[PDB]
Ligand binder design. Structure first.
Ligand SMILES: Cc1cc2nc3c(=O)[nH]c(=O)nc-3n(C[C@H](O)[C@H](O)[C@H](O)COP(=O)(O)OP(=O)(O)OC[C@H]3O[C@@H](n4cnc5c(N)ncnc54)[C@H](O)[C@@H]3O)c2cc1C
Length: 295
């Protein structure tokens, strides 16, 4: 039932860029773009939580063709316009320096994508992934722990759950459970999709809780910068209590290295009731209720 590999690297779908808009506001760190592609002329279908591959042009330092890079799909199955004609991505331009080259180094595929112009043709593969799927159960609870671009699959879940147009398009999925997003970024202008996320919380105060971890603007109880792990520790008992519900699903997404702190916080909470989190977590993963996609 779940669509998978409708297009493969050897014969990708050639999509066209419709729009490329900035998500980081003035005063923010880095570049993160929302890119929408036209799918007409192909049969690429997908669902929330999946990813697609993008094959950038050119050759690598060895003269070998560049391979695909995976990107979490940022749009619901219907696309941002709820017309079943497009697909969107949330791409951060990767950049670093010295440790690997002269000075500032720019990632190949991410730079290609963040600077791509509307009208351009792009090689797309997929969709792929069954690790970050949303339950069909309208009464499920959904915990979302996201850092930076990790917000991407969360957007697909939240839009499907709370956008007026989505609710009208999905008769069978009228969400009535509880969703809690803990989103970590360095600054307020770096809060990707800030306006829409806050709009959802205002309309559904009883079904959606929004918690921020802004490192350059907030300090944790220890005096250090505020990160997602700090917010999880702050609400460890509550999160653990929600996780105990048989219908609760948890999703973690973003750059690797965020899982350790999250586990330490939940472990301390579960231990108070004689439960070893690492073991409970293994069962949750086996049951398909603990979803992780870090990179
Ligand atoms: C399932 C999945 C989903 C993903 N979803 C998204 C998403 O929604 N949005 C998004 O922006 N990205 C996402 N990513 C990451 C994305 O696939 C690419 O890895 C990323 O965009 C960089 O690719 P590039 O082509 O720009 O970089 P490359 O040109 O391949 O550069 C990356 C390479 O350079 C090195 N490098 C990278 N950072 C550093 C550093 N700080 N210091 C030193 N060396 C470094 C490493 O050798 C790395 O392999 C996802 C990855 C996976 C696996």
């Amino acid at each position: 039932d779940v669509p998978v590999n409708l297009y493969r690297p050897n014969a990708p779908f050639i999509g066209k860029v419709i729009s490329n808009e900035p998500l980081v506001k003035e005063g923010g760190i880095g570049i993160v773009q929302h890119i929408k592609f036209d799918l007409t002329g192909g049969n690429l279908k997908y669902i929330e939580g999946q990813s697609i591959g993008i094959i950038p042009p050119g050759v690598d330092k060895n003269g070998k063709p560049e391979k695909l890079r995976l990107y979490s799909i940022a749009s619901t199955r219907h696309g941002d316009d709820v017309d079943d004609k497009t697909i969107s991505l949330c791409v951060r331009q990767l950049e670093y320096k010295h440790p690997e080259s002269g000075e500032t180094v720019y990632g190949v595929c991410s730079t290609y994508l963040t600077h791509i112009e509307p009208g351009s043709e792009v090689k797309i593969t997929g969709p792929v992934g069954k690790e970050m799927l949303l339950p069909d159960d309208p009464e499920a609870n959904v915990i979302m722990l996201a850092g930076g671009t990790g917000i991407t699959p969360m957007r697909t879940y939240l839009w499907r759950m709370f956008k007026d147009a989505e609710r009208a398009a999905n008769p069978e999925y009228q969400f009535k459970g509880f969703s809690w997003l803990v989103f970590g970024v360095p600054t307020t202008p770096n809060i990707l999709y800030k306006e829409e996320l806050e709009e959802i919380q205002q309309k559904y105060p009883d079904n959606f809780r929004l918690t921020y971890a802004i490192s350059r603007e907030q300090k944790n109880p220890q005096g250090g910068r505020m990160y997602i792990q700090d917010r999880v520790a702050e609400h460890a008992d509550q999160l653990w209590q929600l996780i105990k519900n048989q219908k609760t699903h948890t999703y973690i997404c973003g750059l690797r290295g965020m899982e350790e702190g999250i586990d330490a916080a939940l472990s301390a909470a579960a231990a108070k009731e004689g439960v070893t989190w690492s073991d409970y977590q293994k069962d949750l993963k086996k049951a398909g209720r603990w979803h992780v996609e870090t990179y």
